[PDB]
């Protein structure tokens, strides 16, 4: 097994993936390490299971079919494993927490939002279809694009929506295009 958190690249109280040398810290993995279960499989592994058992799974889709599919355990699943992807990238620091908006000339959102906020609305099991997720997830880049205008922060937004959006086409398998 790895020596580090594959999501933080940290040292520390790790628990390792029995089906891969992965490691996690226990609230880094998504969903939380489970309490026993041995073996244990990480979220990588499971996601893989699901492309080996459907290989048809990995065809193309279309994004509006994709928003629309309910929350049944394996879409619950994979915005899990979209979630912890974005934690993967260290720039994702700028957005784990609750955010607050004094600048001058700028106003806050009237719906602000953060990756710790979702975290928790999937752990809660609130989001009924992959759109709420979605519109969660791309909500957080939206509103600090507005927030910071023409500063030149504006484009830590930009490259973690990159990293969330290649993400999503990845494991939702979304149709290729020019
Ligand atoms: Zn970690
Ligand atoms: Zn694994
Ligand atoms: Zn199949």
Known sequence: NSN????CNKWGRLFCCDTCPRSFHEHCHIPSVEANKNPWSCIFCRIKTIQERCPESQSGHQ??????????????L???????????????????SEP?????????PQK??????????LNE??????????????LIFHNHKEFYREDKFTRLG?????????NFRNIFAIQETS
């Open 4 to 7: 580090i958190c594959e999501v």
């Open 63 to 76: 994004e509006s079919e994709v928003l629309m599919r309910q929350m049944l355990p394996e879409e619950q």
């Open 78 to 96: 994979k915005c899990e494993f979209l979630l912890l992807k974005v934690y993967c990238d260290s720039k994702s620091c700028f957005f784990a």
């Open 100 to 108: 607050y908006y004094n600048r001058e000339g700028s106003q806050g």
């Open 112 to 121: 602000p939002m953060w990756l710790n906020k979702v975290k928790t609305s």
């Open 125 to 138: 099991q609130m989001y009924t279809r992959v759109e709420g997720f979605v519109q969660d997830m791309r």
């Open 158 to 166: 930009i490259q973690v929506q990159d990293i969330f959006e290649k």
